[PDB]
């Protein structure tokens, strides 16, 4: 009974110290010791929480949350605890007059956070305007990162491949969308950018090397010689020919798994393990080509470019997520066959093939390319801001109200409670500003409700003004960092039905 | 304590401990923070770790730790299942005492009720190899996905599902079906990510091969037989009841026998690394006595007591030895594999944080115990709460045909099995009473099947479409230990606690 | 904590049910209660215990109203209805811990009570009132619990023949308040006079001039009293005023053709003056005074007459009809009997006369024959009879346990707890008899599977079906009225 | 949160009201008895607040404000505490009206910037080129000290020292370069500027020491002349190489830092240095280590190998002035173009109580003159600048709007506390004197000029600026927690 109070009400008192310190006009706190002459006055939230000894065993959970946020960026650490405190404050009404399962409330936050991030993306602005000057400066920055690296030999050709590897993505800039192949017997100057998804291994023997109107399906199973370790078994049979009957009976059962594949109408199959000749020979009449040695990234990255799924099982026939590609071409370079795909539907990715003269040049070029692409990918999350001053906080409340329309009975009060915590951010910022927070937040919701999505709250004039004319913006990367940190921190706390005090070190 | 006192207190003492783990039961439960006194910090929902950390003076809850210690070797994942099931039997046993039934009748009454329910579950059980052979691979892959869904491992779970399949098979035989936990090594280090984790078929020893000039990869040396390793049970030092001359005599026995690497229990001097550097013969130092057995078994080696007893037959042979740099860690450990099936398997998992490594280590180790029970019995049953509902309806229906005093002991056993689906229904956000009546109605008028409580959000019954199966030997081991525990509790009518001096 | 206030009343209600539980059956444990006035009484009757218990608990007083209706309707089971009421309260404790609202608990009792009646009627053997051999053996077994045994054989047809005359057909509820047991000093048990017309509680005039007998008389009900006014030529002046006041009342009596009149008993002033008896003696008018106030409402029903407050409104239509009015005294009784009323609105109200020497005779006989009329009353309203001793309660718990799977939701679990709440009645009967509690209960489920209602029939134990039906019906409303109270406050 | 702030305001108001009685020379002095038994008596607000050992965390901020008050302006340490408490007393009714402290805090900073321009318009513009107002400024400031006739002689000494180091755009000048060396003996009439440098101690009084040298180099050396400390010729051989390495750089002035660890110069080394006429001055305090490294442009030298010629200064003539109980060594013509010449004046007198209070009196005289360096002009004290600001804010308060309009009314009322206290400490009626000053305000403005009472503008300017941020930071802390 007291575990819920210490995890909810007890966690508010921890966030109350950083509640009034948010913002440049926010208040300050005092840290006093026994001697009282060592004290100091500062607005830093991370210093106050770590300096004050906390006897509350549930308060130590929020300590590790601030440490993860500080690694990403040193700004917004205070806003993480404040936003997480508003979700725990409204959790009291989620119990007494609600009686809703806590995990269902957490699952409602994932549906609300999905619409909140999409609402901020459409309203996000950037300084990338006049890209002619912006795109030209991208190649000069990549050349500066080439110092001490073997790629410094040619700055123009090597940095040009890294420039087109970023802007042409039109999506997530993470390295998971970039494929790197290490090969031998060539020069680094011959490297080029190709989106055909080139991998080392080949597939098939008598099958043709060109496929038109291909249908790609991704699955993971072993259809050939399961139980790879035969040591220890005991085969009791009356004759030698009777021992092979069990292996022949498994071949007849393979038609059940092949029938589900043939009903999908796919000419291309993906397999991590090998395939026996008999199920492979039956694929010749159906024209099914199986690709082997897909590793892990090759399984996930193929589903991203072709719009597939990573599930290895079939839950129901004629229902699944299928991809496709126009042409599959197999070429040979460097005395090894290569696989170059063509015509992938909505395919967005790039593959930089590094051809070195030895193994030492391949490992140094791959590690140096990731550092060069990290700086170019950082420019997407840097300098890009959004309209602040209550604007972005209120816009997220509109996307939550959209999901609050069509909802079940359990998550109805959970999604609606999340919209109240979003309006608490401009309320607290207006508290230390010296003005009335209830009047500014109320008039802000009615204005953005119908039209005028760029409006915000002005701290100087204490009224609603255009944020584009005032020029008050906040970083978009900071918005996602706080929401992602608050979603993971509140996910553990709401699931707590009891508190186990940690052992002191 | 007396009869009118302790018998009433033993029931209330078990309900306080059982009610703590009822919230953490299932994948939707709570992950608790626990810190061992040795300095290890990890977060897991495993009941065997949570119950082991419980320190209390009540003798009723101490039997839970004693039972979970022996159950950890057999299964280890059924700790939360047995405690809740055993506490359900004590709840119905309290009412039988007030009716004038001796407590020994309750202990002997559950023995006939447990054995009768086993034969009823076997009739409705299905077999894997006797039905579909190609689905045997998918059964082992999706078994670990349920336990790993509550952890960060659930993102990469597709690749890690195959690693747990080969780790169990290597240490067991198809006919014998014997798996030892001491043969499966669970290790991990800080740094890197989980995507670089690979399976190791041999020991590790965390050796950097001393001076870096030594080759990091062992060559086959013109098609030789494996890679010969030396095992020495004697320390490196000159014989005592000239020191450089004795060093040249001991290295000759290694070169003549063909041992590439030398493993010893005691440290080496600085001159030893100078002579071994010219011959490209890496050395191994500070190896425990327990780890010496796993090397000779996997590499097919022998224990050589003396210096001159070396020979090609007593040297352990492996596939190859290579030193692969892992991230920025300066340890630069080794990986020793083997072509043939060995008895030693070492799991190697990396993580960006120390708490992440220990979180995924015990989560992956629990997946090895689930696969261990699946390969022990080819026949599996549908779990998720369907096993407790089906076995309860068989005992409750046959209770009317069995007369005598045990007639009421059978009704209490059927109602005690309903505690599991009602507990999981509360953790899933459903009515525990409404779901229990719903599962019994669908299995009676419609058709006989196994439908349990929904672990994931869905709109209706019949989880059989999701192909969620549990091992028969795993579920049978839980009801046997829960029945034996309930009998042992009734055999202690007095609590004797001595004072302190 | 609105429910914890009700939970405190449930625990206090279970303590009262457990106290009465030990008194069930003839072998039950008696309860000693010392009143504040100093009276010390003891008995095994649950209705008398709760009446003098003076319960100050507001919810616990509901058992008194149910026990009062239990004896007024069925007449038997006042102790068993308290045990059945406490059984549902004990099972409702585990229901509140699961988050079940008492409305579903109360609504499910309505469907459970109506279902238990239909199941009981299927195994019950329907009997008819045309067979007099069944009613004699039914009332004779109820008289075996009293000291009178060999003399109870003649009392069996006495209670049977009285009900069959007023039973008719489709009578539904039959009020037994019209049947009064007359207790007089003298006589014996074997001496009884039915006197189906009516029987009064008082004697006749022992003075001179009283006719004491009249043929073709009309008996009216007059609450007035003839007395001299009670708010020494002077002597005769008072006599002329008193005799004129007494004669003017008698003038309207002769014109109304009133042979027999009644006078309400008043201890304050004089009832009937001696001069008034001599005035009506010449007119051949019988006078019966000192009529008890309790019998005023009784005679206003069976006789079909109406009370006359004022002589001005007194008419002939308010009188009665009697063919013969005589005074027959066996020994010392001096009682007047009336036969052949033949009233259209009124019915044949029969008053049973009981004679005895010692005071303990007419007393114990009154309570013995009163319960015998209640058992016969149960057969009139609801036909059929079952074997007592908790035999049908075992099979009902077995059928409802299997039919509980047909339901769905929270209500399905209530049927399982309702079957266990019905097993407390047969368990208590085995405990109060010295037999092993759990051992006898297990033997009930074993034997009732193969056989049906099979031995109490050889032991002549017959419980009417209306008692077992009303016990479940009244308990469903009693437990409902409990859980529906969520709080209580001072109101005045 | 008000329970934390209101408890701190009331606690700080009682401290400000207690120091308020100490304003002026006629004010009520406060006594503080330390636990060790020491009792001090004085009207200085910086001394009272330092030895009071205040346990209130917010009230301790007045010590830092009083420290910066004397370091910047040099006067008004008591007045800045009164103005701080005046704003806290008027803020009690502000919280009762529902006013958020942000508007209260932001209005104090906006009013402090506007109050400066009001004082500059009413102030008289003066320049540092005229020595008429500069001499009379330091002469009248010494009327509060025992010195009377000698105050006119030290007036041109303080004026000529500041004007040389003030320049134009230098603005703030470090006061650490001004060191007054006091010694018993002599008198006030004997003064020497000695712009080169002045040490804190005498020279070697032993036999053989030249004590005077011409054209010598001065440098900081942390080494010490001692025998071997992990036979006569062995110790002299170890000391021979020490004096030989010094001769390589031609350093005739050896300054050894005072340390109780070992000795300074051995007696055997005195005969070696007597032939080369190398003067040595020992007992150099640790505070003078940083002082000598600035004006002389030298560097501290820890070891004998670190000693080089490039780190040595230049001294035209180094001699020991003969005086009773003094023996002061002077250095002239350091010839340092990059660093400005330091100002160090030797204070002499017969009684120990003379050279003590004289050193403190000259510190306040140099600060008032330094106030004209940052901002020229002066405003006569006695409540004139406090009342003049309230006169302009009367009509300006009506031009505001919102919550801030009421703050300007209470801001002018809090400024009247300073002239009210000055009238109370003089025995005159508080309100009666203030009304007479506002009555003549229609004609007279700054008129005290005939009484030779002058005050710099920086004192009145810094008192408002420091008190504005002080009270601003008080309302920022809404809670007090224990952190260790």
From Swiss-Prot, chain A:
Localisation per UniProt entry: Cytoplasm
Gene Ontology molecular-function annotations: ATP binding; ATP hydrolysis activity; ATP-dependent protein folding chaperone; unfolded protein binding
Listed InterPro entries: Chap_CCT_beta (IPR012716), Chaperone_TCP-1 (IPR017998), Chaperonin_TCP-1_CS (IPR002194), Cpn60/GroEL/TCP-1 (IPR002423), GroEL-like_apical_dom_sf (IPR027409), GROEL-like_equatorial_sf (IPR027413), TCP-1-like_intermed_sf (IPR027410)
Coiled-coil regions listed in the entry: none
Keyword Chaperone (UniProt): yes
Keyword Acetylation recorded: yes
PROSITE patterns with a match to the protein in the record: TCP1_1 (PS00750), TCP1_2 (PS00751), TCP1_3 (PS00995)
Stored Pfam families: Cpn60_TCP1
GO biological process, alphabetically ordered: chaperone mediated protein folding independent of cofactor; protein folding
Domain of life per record: Eukaryota
Predominant place of localization: cytoplasm
Cellular component terms (Gene Ontology): chaperonin-containing T-complex; cytoplasm
Summary of subunit composition and partner proteins: Heterooligomeric complex of about 850 to 900 kDa that forms two stacked rings, 12 to 16 nm in diameter. Interacts with PLP2; this interaction leads to inhibition of CCT complex mediated actin folding.
Protein purpose: Molecular chaperone; assists the folding of proteins upon ATP hydrolysis. Known to play a role, in vitro, in the folding of actin and tubulin. In yeast may play a role in mitotic spindle formation.
Family affiliation: Belongs to the TCP-1 chaperonin family.
Name of the molecule in the record: T-complex protein 1 subunit beta
Organism: Saccharomyces cerevisiae (strain ATCC 204508 / S288c) (Baker's yeast)
Lineage: Eukaryota, Fungi, Dikarya, Ascomycota, Saccharomycotina
Swiss-Prot record, chain B:
Family: Belongs to the TCP-1 chaperonin family.
GO terms assigned for molecular function: ATP binding; ATP hydrolysis activity; ATP-dependent protein folding chaperone; unfolded protein binding
Gene3D superfamilies xref list: GroEL (3.50.7.10), GroEL-like equatorial domain (1.10.560.10), TCP-1-like chaperonin intermediate domain (3.30.260.10)
InterPro entries recorded: Chap_CCT_epsi, Chaperone_TCP-1, Chaperonin_TCP-1_CS, Cpn60/GroEL/TCP-1, GroEL-like_apical_dom_sf, GROEL-like_equatorial_sf, TCP-1-like_intermed_sf, TCP-1_chaperonin
Gene Ontology CC: chaperonin-containing T-complex
Pfam hit, one: Cpn60_TCP1
Keywords recorded for this protein, A-Z: ATP-binding, Chaperone, Cytoplasm, Nucleotide-binding
Entry function: Molecular chaperone; assists the folding of proteins upon ATP hydrolysis. Known to play a role, in vitro, in the folding of actin and tubulin. In yeast may play a role in mitotic spindle formation.
Subcellular location: Cytoplasm
Gene Ontology terms: biological process: chaperone mediated protein folding independent of cofactor; protein folding
Originating organism: Saccharomyces cerevisiae (strain ATCC 204508 / S288c) (Baker's yeast)
Main location: cytoplasm
Stated name of the protein: T-complex protein 1 subunit epsilon
Coiled-coil region(s): none
Subunit (UniProt): Heterooligomeric complex of about 850 to 900 kDa that forms two stacked rings, 12 to 16 nm in diameter.
Xref: NCBIfam families: chap_CCT_epsi (TIGR02343), thermosome_alpha (NF041082), thermosome_beta (NF041083)
UniProtKB/Swiss-Prot annotation, chain C:
Lineage top rank: taxon: Eukaryota
Major localization class: cytoplasm
GO molecular function, one term: ATP hydrolysis activity
Protein's cellular compartments: Cytoplasm
Any single GO CC term annotated in Swiss-Prot or TrEMBL for this entry: chaperonin-containing T-complex
Biological-process GO terms, alphabetical: chaperone mediated protein folding independent of cofactor; protein folding
Entry-linked InterPro entries: Chap_CCT_delta (IPR012717), Chaperone_TCP-1 (IPR017998), Chaperonin_TCP-1_CS (IPR002194), Cpn60/GroEL/TCP-1 (IPR002423), GroEL-like_apical_dom_sf (IPR027409), GROEL-like_equatorial_sf (IPR027413), TCP-1-like_intermed_sf (IPR027410), TCP-1_chaperonin (IPR053374)
Keywords in alphabetical order: ATP-binding, Chaperone, Cytoplasm, Nucleotide-binding
NCBIfam families (UniProt xref): chap_CCT_delta, thermosome_alpha, thermosome_beta
Assembly and oligomerization: Heterooligomeric complex of about 850 to 900 kDa that forms two stacked rings, 12 to 16 nm in diameter.
Record PANTHER family: CHAPERONIN
Misc. comment: Present with 5530 molecules/cell in log phase SD medium.
Family assignment from sequence similarity: Belongs to the TCP-1 chaperonin family.
Function: Molecular chaperone; assists the folding of proteins upon ATP hydrolysis. Known to play a role, in vitro, in the folding of actin and tubulin. In yeast may play a role in mitotic spindle formation.
The name this protein goes by in its record: T-complex protein 1 subunit delta
Originating species: Saccharomyces cerevisiae (strain ATCC 204508 / S288c) (Baker's yeast)
Lineage, broadest ranks: Eukaryota, Fungi, Dikarya, Ascomycota, Saccharomycotina
């Amino acid at each position: 009974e007291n575990a819920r109070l210490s995890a909810f009400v007890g966690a508010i008192a921890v966030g109350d110290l950083v509640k009034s310190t948010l913002g440049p006009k926010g208040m300050d706190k005092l840290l006093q010791s026994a001697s009282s002459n060592t004290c100091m006055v500062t607005n830093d939230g991370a210093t106050i929480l770590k300096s004050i000894p906390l006897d509350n065993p549930a308060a130590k959970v929020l300590v590790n949350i601030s440490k993860v946020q500080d690694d990403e960026v040193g700004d917004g650490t205070t806003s993480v605890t404040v936003l997480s405190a508003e979700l725990l404050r409204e959790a009291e009404k989620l119990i007494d007059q609600s009686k809703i399962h806590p995990q269902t409330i957490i699952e409602g936050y994932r549906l609300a956070s999905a619409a909140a991030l999409d609402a901020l993306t459409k309203a996000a602005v950037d300084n990338s305007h006049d890209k002619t000057m912006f795109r030209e400066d991208l190649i000069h920055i990549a050349k500066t990162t080439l110092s001490s690296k073997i790629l410094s030999q040619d700055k123009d050709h090597f940095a040009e491949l890294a420039t087109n590897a970023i802007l042409r993505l039109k999506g997530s800039t993470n390295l998971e969308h970039i494929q790197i192949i290490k090969i031998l017997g060539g020069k680094l100057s011959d490297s080029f950018l190709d989106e055909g998804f080139i991998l080392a291994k080949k597939f098939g023997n008598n099958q043709p090397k060109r496929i038109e109107n291909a249908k790609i399906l991704i699955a993971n199973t072993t259809l050939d010689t399961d139980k790879v370790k035969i040591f220890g078994t005991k085969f009791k049979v009356d004759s030698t020919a009777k021992l092979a009957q069990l292996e022949k009976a498994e071949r007849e059962k393979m038609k059940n798994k092949i029938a589900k594949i043939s009903k999908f109408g796919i000419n291309t199959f993906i397999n991590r393990q090998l395939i026996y000749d008999y199920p492979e020979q039956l694929f010749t009449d159906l024209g099914i080509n199986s690709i082997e040695h897909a590793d892990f990234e090759g399984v996930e990255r193929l589903a991203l470019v072709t719009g597939g799924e990573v599930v290895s099982t079939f839950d129901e026939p004629s229902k699944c997520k299928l991809g496709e590609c126009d042409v599959i071409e197999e070429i040979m370079l460097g005395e090894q066959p290569f696989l170059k795909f063509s015509g992938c539907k909505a395919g967005e990715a790039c593959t930089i093939v590094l051809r070195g003269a030895t193994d030492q040049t391949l490992d140094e070029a791959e590690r140096s390319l990731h550092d060069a692409l990290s700086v170019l990918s950082q420019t997407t999350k840097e300098t890009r801001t959004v309209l602040g001053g209550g604007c972005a906080e209120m816009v997220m409340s509109k996307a939550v109200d959209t999901e609050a329309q069509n909802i079940d009975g359990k998550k109805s009060l959970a999604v609606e409670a999340f919209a109240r915590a979003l309006r608490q951010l401009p309320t607290i910022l207006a508290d230390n500003a010296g003005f009335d927070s209830s009047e500014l937040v109320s008039k802000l919701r009615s204005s953005i409700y119908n039209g005028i999505s760029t409006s915000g709250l002005d701290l100087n004039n204490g009224t609603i003004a255009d944020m584009r004319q005032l020029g008050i913006v906040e970083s978009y990367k900071l918005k996602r960092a706080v929401v992602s940190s608050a979603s993971e921190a509140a996910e553990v706390l709401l699931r707590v039905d009891n508190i186990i005090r940690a052992r002191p070190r | 304590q007396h009869g009118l006192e302790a018998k009433k207190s033993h029931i209330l003492a078990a309900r306080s401990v059982a009610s703590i783990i009822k919230t953490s039961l299932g994948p939707r439960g709570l992950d608790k923070i626990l810190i061992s006194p040795d300095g290890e910090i990890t977060i897991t929902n495993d009941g065997a770790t949570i119950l082991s950390q419980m320190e209390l003076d009540n003798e009723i809850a101490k039997l839970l730790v004693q039972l979970s210690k022996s159950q950890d070797d057999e299964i280890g994942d059924g700790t939360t299942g047995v405690v809740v099931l055993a506490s359900a039997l004590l709840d119905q046993a309290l009412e039988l005492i007030q009716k004038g039934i001796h407590p020994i009748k309750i202990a002997n009454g559950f023995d006939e009720a447990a054995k009768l329910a086993i034969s009823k579950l076997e009739e409705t059980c299905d077999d894997i190899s006797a039905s579909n052979d190609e689905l045997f691979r998918d059964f082992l892959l999706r078994a670990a996905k349920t336990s790993l869904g509550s952890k960060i491992v659930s993102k990469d779970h597709d690749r890690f599902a195959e690693m747990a399949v080969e780790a169990v098979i290597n240490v067991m035989d198809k006919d014998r079906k014997d798996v030892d936990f001491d043969l499966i090594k669970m290790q991990g280090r800080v740094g890197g990510s989980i995507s670089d984790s690979k399976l190791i078929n041999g020991v590790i020893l965390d050796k950097d091969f001393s001076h870096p000039q030594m080759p990091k990869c062992v060559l086959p040396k013109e098609g030789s037989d494996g890679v010969k390793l030396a095992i020495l049970t004697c320390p490196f030092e000159p014989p005592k009841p000239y020191e450089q001359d004795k060093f040249k005599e001991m290295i000759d026995d290694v070169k003549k026998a063909g041992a590439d690497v030398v493993i010893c229990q005691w440290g080496f001097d600085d001159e030893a690394n100078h002579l071994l550097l010219q011959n490209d013969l890496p050395a191994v130092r500070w190896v425990g006595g327990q780890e010496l057995e796993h090397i000779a078994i996997s590499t097919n080696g022998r224990i050589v007591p003396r210096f001159q007893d070396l020979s090609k037959d007593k040297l352990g042979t492996c596939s190859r030895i290579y030193e692969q740099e892992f991230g920025t860690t300066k340890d630069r450990m080794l990986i020793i594999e083997q072509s043939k099936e060995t008895k030693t398997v070492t799991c190697f998992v990396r993580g960006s944080n120390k708490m992440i490594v220990d979180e995924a280590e015990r989560a992956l180790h629990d997946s090895l115990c689930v696969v261990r029970n699946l390969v022990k019995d080819s026949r599996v049953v549908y779990g998720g709460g369907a096993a407790e509902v089906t076995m309860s309806l068989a005992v409750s229906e046959e209770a009317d045909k069995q007369r005598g005093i045990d007639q009421y002991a059978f009704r209490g056993f059927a109602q005690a099995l309903d505690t599991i689906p009602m507990t999981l229904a509360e953790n899933s956000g459903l009515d525990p009473i409404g779901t229990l009546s719903t599962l019994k109605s669908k299995q009676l008028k419609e058709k006989i099947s196994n439908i349990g409580v929904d672990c994931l959000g869905y709109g209706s019954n019949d989880m059989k479409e999701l192909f969620v199966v549990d091992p028969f030997i795993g579920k049978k081991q839980q009801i046997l230990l829960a029945t034996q525990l309930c009998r042992m509790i009734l055999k202690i009518d007095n609590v004797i606690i001595s004072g302190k001096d | 904590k609105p429910q914890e206030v009700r939970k405190a009343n449930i625990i206090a209600a279970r303590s009262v049910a457990d106290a009465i539980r030990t008194s069930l059956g003839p072998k039950g444990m008696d309860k000693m209660i010392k009143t504040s006035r100093g009276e010390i009484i003891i008995s095994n009757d649950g209705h008398t215990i709760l009446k003098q218990m003076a319960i100050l608990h507001p919810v616990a007083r509901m058992l008194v109203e149910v026990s009062a209706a239990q004896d007024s309707e069925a007449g038997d089971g006042t102790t068993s209805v308290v045990i059945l009421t406490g059984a549902l309260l004990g099972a409702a404790e585990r229901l509140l811990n699961k988050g079940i609202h008492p409305t579903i608990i109360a609504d499910s009792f309505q469907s459970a009570a109506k279902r238990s009646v239909d199941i009981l009627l299927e195994m019950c053997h329907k009997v008819s009132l045309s067979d007099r051999e069944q009613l004699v053996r039914a009332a004779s077994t109820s008289l075996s619990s009293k000291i009178v045994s060999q003399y109870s054989s003649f009392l069996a047809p006495l209670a049977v023949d009285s009900v069959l005359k007023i039973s008719d057909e489709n009578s539904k509820n039959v009020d037994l308040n019209d049947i009064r047991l007359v207790k007089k000093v003298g006589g014996t048990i074997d001496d009884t006079e039915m006197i189906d017309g009516v029987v009064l509680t008082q004697t006749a005039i022992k003075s001179a001039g009283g006719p004491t007998r009249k043929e073709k008389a009309k008996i009216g009900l007059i609450q007035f009293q003839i007395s001299p006014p009670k708010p020494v030529r002077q002597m005769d002046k008072i006599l002329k005023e008193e005799r004129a006041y007494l004669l003017n009342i008698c003038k309207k009596i002769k014109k109304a053709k009133c042979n027999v009149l009644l006078i309400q008993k008043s201890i304050l002033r004089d009832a009937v003056n001696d001069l008034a008896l001599h005035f009506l003696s010449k007119l051949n008018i019988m006078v019966v005074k000192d009529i008890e106030r309790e019998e005023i409402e009784f005679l206003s029903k069976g006789l079909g007459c109406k009370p006359i407050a004022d002589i001005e409104l007194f008419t002939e239509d308010r009188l009665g009809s009697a063919d013969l009015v005589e005074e027959i005294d066996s020994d010392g009784s001096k009682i007047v009997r009336v036969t052949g009323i033949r009233n259209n609105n009124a019915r044949p109200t029969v008053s049973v006369v009981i004679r005895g020497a010692n005071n303990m005779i007419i007393d114990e006989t009154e309570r013995s024959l009163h319960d015998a009329l209640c058992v016969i009353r149960c057969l009139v309203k609801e036909r059929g009879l079952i074997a007592g001793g908790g035999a049908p309660e075992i099979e009902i718990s077995r059928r409802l346990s299997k039919e509980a799977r047909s339901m769905e939701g929270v209500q399905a679990f209530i049927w399982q707890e309702f079957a266990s709440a019905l097993e407390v009645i047969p368990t208590t009967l085995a405990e109060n008899a010295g037999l092993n509690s759990i051992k006898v209960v297990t033997e009930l489920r074993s034997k009732h599977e193969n056989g049906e209602l099979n031995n109490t029939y050889e032991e002549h134990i017959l419980q009417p079906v209306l008692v077992s039906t009303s016990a479940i019906t009244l308990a469903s409303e009693c437990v409902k009225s409990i859980l529906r109270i969520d709080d209580i406050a001072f109101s005045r």
